[PDB]
Write a protein that binds this ligand. Structure first.
Ligand SMILES: Nc1ncnc2c1ncn2[C@@H]1O[C@H](COP(=O)(O)O)[C@@H](O)[C@H]1O
Ligand SMILES: [Mg+2]
Ligand SMILES: [Mn+2]
Length: 330
């Protein structure tokens, strides 16, 4: 029985999604698993997307200020985890920021900054504490979500890829697979060990924040771990010499002014790594270190504008610098 390596990639959830698997199972079993991975990603785009009119999320947003809406258990659990990270991060990560994001968004398409007052009004509609999750305790009791504040809008952009990466890992595992690299628009989950039959940790790349993306600046060897990076240059537009990126500081309503160029979070669950990466980017380095003390099972790697790199204890020894312009502090 021989080891074989498979990959498959498709444009879905608005980005390139790729899954690579090593397996000794019959090829047909791997093919079935990958078929289901990409079916899932198609189905979940229609549940979670904040920028399609026809998604379950859009439907829920349409009911802001009205009666509770029934949701499936999966979406409920994701919202629960998002609100947990909102609270722990003091709202640096905020899953109800749609009123503001949507105002900037159109800025992106047609390169214009929002309007002062319009922006201030939108900020009044982003209180994630007004998202009420209820689930009864009896058999088959429904799960519901109520957006209490009129005009408030969920946007799960900062946690949905993490959630989907976790869902994919669970799916692979259900198909008796135990070696894969899941890559959803750069949101990585390294499942198990790869093959060289020599077994090796996955070598996960981290990009130069100002690079053309082609080559990684650094690589970190990991097993059974998500690696998710948030950065100031993954998405932005420029107007009159100022750059405006996609990660909003909920206090200002503007793209976060922060002291790091990127933050990469290493965690057993990609949902958690994704939420934390965004929170940390917003909070900046010192406040991130403080927040991260709450989550002992997580590691983090910060790339600074001066190309210094700092990594926490659990991963620093597994980091290798590939672009010598960067320096790993020890
Ligand atoms: N502070 C924030 N908290 C949560 N979601 C955000 C925030 N700022 C922007 N977003 C949304 O989440 C995306 C960024 O997620 P990420 O790339 O995971 O940091 C943005 O493109 C927005 O859709
Ligand atoms: Mg995120
Ligand atoms: Mn992300």
């Amino acid at each position: 029985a021989r080891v074989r390596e498979y990959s498959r990639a498709e444009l879905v959830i608005g980005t390139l999604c790729r899954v690579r698997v090593y397996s000794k199972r019959p090829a047909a079993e791997v093919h079935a698993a990958l078929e289901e991975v990409f079916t899932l990603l198609q189905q979940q785009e229609m549940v979670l997307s904040a920028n399609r009119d026809d998604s379950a999320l859009a439907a829920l947003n349409a009911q802001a200020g009205s009666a509770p809406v029934v949701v499936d258990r999966s979406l409920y659990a994701l919202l629960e985890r998002a609100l947990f990270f909102a609270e722990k991060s003091g709202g640096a990560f905020n899953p109800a920021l749609g009123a503001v994001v949507k105002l900037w968004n159109i800025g992106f398409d047609r390169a214009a900054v929002p309007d002062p007052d319009a922006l201030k009004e939108a900020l009044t509609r982003c209180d994630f504490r007004q998202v009420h999750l209820r689930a009864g305790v009896s058999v088959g009791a429904p799960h519901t979500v109520q957006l209490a504040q009129a005009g408030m809008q969920l946007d799960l952009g900062a946690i949905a890829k993490g959630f989907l990466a976790d869902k994919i890992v669970q799916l692979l595992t259900a198909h008796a697979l135990d070696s894969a690299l899941v890559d959803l628009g750069g949101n990585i989950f390294a499942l198990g060990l790869k093959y060289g039959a020599q077994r090796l940790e996955w070598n996960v790349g981290i990009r130069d924040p100002h690079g053309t993306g082609q080559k990684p600046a650094l690589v970190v060897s990991v097993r059974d771990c998500s690696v998710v990076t948030s950065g100031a240059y993954e998405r932005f537009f420029e107007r009159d010499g100022v750059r405006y990126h996609h990660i909003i500081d909920p206090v200002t309503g503007f793209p976060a002014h922060t002291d790091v160029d990127s933050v990469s979070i290493f965690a057993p669950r990609s949902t958690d790594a994704d939420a934390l990466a965004t929170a940390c980017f917003v909070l900046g380095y010192e406040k991130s270190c403080a927040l991260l003390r709450e989550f002992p099972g997580v590691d983090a790697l910060f790339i600074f504008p001066d190309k210094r790199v700092r990594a926490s204890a659990g991963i620093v020894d597994r980091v290798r610098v590939l672009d010598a312009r960067f320096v790993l502090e020890r």
